[PDB]
């Protein structure tokens, strides 16, 4: 096997960052008085 881990790490950081920005969107809904 091609012992390289870039695409896997790429999708992982992508989904993690997506969850994190959508959490920050939850705060945008919250703190917006």
């Amino acid at each position: 096997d091609s012992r390289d881990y870039s695409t896997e790490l790429s999708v992982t950081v992508a989904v993690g960052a997506s969850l994190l920005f959508l959490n920050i969107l939850a705060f945008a809904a919250l703190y917006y008085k």
Binding site: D1, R3, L9, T12, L19, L20, A26, L30
Partner: protein
């Protein structure tokens, strides 16, 4: 609007808690924390307790060993401590999902605070696990698989795989959800 928005974000926070519990379970179970590299002598990967190593004959033939229910097979004490702390985090986050039921009877704000504390503690446990796990790389098995250059707190030839970065993501998600729970519990009081 105010009650509607608070209810909506509270439900979204519950879904986030469920998602983080899924993340914690999969990172604890799947043993893909660190993997081989092109320069590695012998192919394989290893998680918190389970580790698979290749025989090294231009084939896969991965021999796999390790299991949390038998601490003897775990390579090193640091691995044992990391596994225990991640298990404790799992117990806490799973406990939070159970507490959800208290919303039927108890006051909302107090239970929000209970989970805020639980999720903070789970984040701390995950932080401790991720901090102590690199200490075990000086064990003979990981050194043999990765090579002699690897040592304590040194990746060396081996490279990180998806489970470790997912663990870091879980730490951030847990801490931020804990803050969200605190703010919501204080916001419901108004």
């Amino acid at each position: 609007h105010y009650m509607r928005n608070s209810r909506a974000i509270g439900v979204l926070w519950a879904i986030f808690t469920i998602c983080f519990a899924i993340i914690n379970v999969v990172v604890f179970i799947q043993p893909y924390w660190v993997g081989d590299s092109v320069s590695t002598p012998k192919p394989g990967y290893f998680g918190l307790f389970h580790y698979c190593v290749g025989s090294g004959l231009a084939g896969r033939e991965l021999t796999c060993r390790g299991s949390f229910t038998d601490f003897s097979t775990i390579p090193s004490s640091a691995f044992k401590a990391a596994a225990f702390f991640v298990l404790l985090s799992m117990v806490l986050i799973l406990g939070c999902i159970t507490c959800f039921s208290l919303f039927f009877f108890c006051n909302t704000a107090t239970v929000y605070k209970i989970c805020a504390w639980m999720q903070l503690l789970a984040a701390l446990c995950l932080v401790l696990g991720c901090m102590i796990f690199p200490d075990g790389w000086d064990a003979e098995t990981i050194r043999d698989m990765c090579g002699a250059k690897t040592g304590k707190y040194s990746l060396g030839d081996c490279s990180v795989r998806w489970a470790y970065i997912l663990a870091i993501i879980g730490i951030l998600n847990a801490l931020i959800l804990s803050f969200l729970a605190f703010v919501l519990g204080n916001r419901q009081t108004d």
